[PDB]
Amino acid sequence: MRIILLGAPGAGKGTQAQFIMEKYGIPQISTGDMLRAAVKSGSELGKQAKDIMDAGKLVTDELVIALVKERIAQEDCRNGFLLDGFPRTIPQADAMKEAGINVDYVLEFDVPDELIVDRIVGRRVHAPSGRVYHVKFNPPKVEGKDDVTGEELTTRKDDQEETVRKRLVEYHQMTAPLIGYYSKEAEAGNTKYAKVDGTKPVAEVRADLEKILG
Ligand SMILES: Nc1nc2c(ncn2[C@@H]2O[C@H](COP(=O)(O)OP(=O)(O)CP(=O)(O)O)[C@@H](O)[C@H]2O)c(=O)[nH]1
Ligand SMILES: [Mg+2]
């Protein structure tokens, strides 16, 4: 089973990764994990990636696709793989096709923007220890305090509402054509495509996934 899982930043698609991995006996793979592992390994692609990253440059789509192709040839992908959060653009999807990398399902994990903003802006952290909380959905023991140390909890600057909203605007503009691309691929019989309501309780999402995936 070969699955691409797509979702907006903050939607929390990763909440279903372990369910999928355990269902099919497949690893969760990502461009970030692939790059880190390649650089650490000193492989040929890893050396190219390290030189680019060490200069503060972005790896090319061609190198990213080559890393995907290499990753899925590894023995742990014999049963398939869960490719998390990539492709991100039509050019990247077409490069997957040109390279010969088809998947069985593309799953779009949807959460409304306003709920994403709620899910994120309510987060609070204790930076010294990296413990995190949420005001409405997972309140702390003592209002505004880490129930351990009692130091004033903070909010991460990346989690500021205006930064969150800007990220979502950019994501939808980038992703709309890609969703349409995969719906077309499904119409052509090359893959299957389904949207998932990620706002539901996790067991409800899981049941919806089971109906999609058979
Ligand atoms: N912080 C940050 N994240 C970004 C940016 N652009 C895209 N992202 C993506 O947004 C996500 C932010 O993480 P988080 O707020 O935990 O979102 P999430 O949906 O719960 C994480 P997951 O997709 O694994 O379930 C990351 O997956 C990150 O790769 C950016 O400019 N800043
Ligand atoms: Mg994830």
Side-chain angles (χ1 to χ4, degrees), residues 13-14 28 84:
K13 65 187 152 46
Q28 177 185 16
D84 184 350

mmCIF file of all heavy atoms in Angstrom, residues 13-14 28 84, ligand 2:
data_model
loop_
_atom_site.group_PDB
_atom_site.id
_atom_site.type_symbol
_atom_site.label_atom_id
_atom_site.label_comp_id
_atom_site.label_asym_id
_atom_site.label_seq_id
_atom_site.Cartn_x
_atom_site.Cartn_y
_atom_site.Cartn_z
ATOM 1 N N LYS A 13 -2.620 16.151 10.223
ATOM 2 C CA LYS A 13 -2.732 14.872 9.523
ATOM 3 C C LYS A 13 -1.902 13.772 10.174
ATOM 4 O O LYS A 13 -2.255 12.593 10.059
ATOM 5 C CB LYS A 13 -2.309 15.049 8.077
ATOM 6 C CG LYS A 13 -0.851 15.417 7.861
ATOM 7 C CD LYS A 13 -0.540 15.754 6.399
ATOM 8 C CE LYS A 13 0.634 16.734 6.161
ATOM 9 N NZ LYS A 13 1.905 16.487 6.920
ATOM 10 N N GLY A 14 -0.815 14.141 10.857
ATOM 11 C CA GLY A 14 0.039 13.153 11.495
ATOM 12 C C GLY A 14 -0.661 12.349 12.563
ATOM 13 O O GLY A 14 -0.160 11.286 12.950
ATOM 14 N N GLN A 28 6.498 5.691 7.598
ATOM 15 C CA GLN A 28 6.153 7.066 7.269
ATOM 16 C C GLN A 28 7.426 7.745 6.797
ATOM 17 O O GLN A 28 8.457 7.732 7.486
ATOM 18 C CB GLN A 28 5.614 7.751 8.524
ATOM 19 C CG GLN A 28 5.258 9.238 8.389
ATOM 20 C CD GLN A 28 4.841 9.860 9.729
ATOM 21 O OE1 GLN A 28 5.086 9.302 10.803
ATOM 22 N NE2 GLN A 28 4.220 10.996 9.660
ATOM 23 N N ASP A 84 4.399 11.545 3.547
ATOM 24 C CA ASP A 84 3.721 12.567 4.324
ATOM 25 C C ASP A 84 4.070 13.946 3.792
ATOM 26 O O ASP A 84 5.211 14.386 3.919
ATOM 27 C CB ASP A 84 4.222 12.432 5.760
ATOM 28 C CG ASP A 84 3.536 13.359 6.728
ATOM 29 O OD1 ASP A 84 2.797 14.258 6.316
ATOM 30 O OD2 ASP A 84 3.728 13.162 7.944
HETATM 31 MG MG MG B 2 3.133 14.715 9.895
#
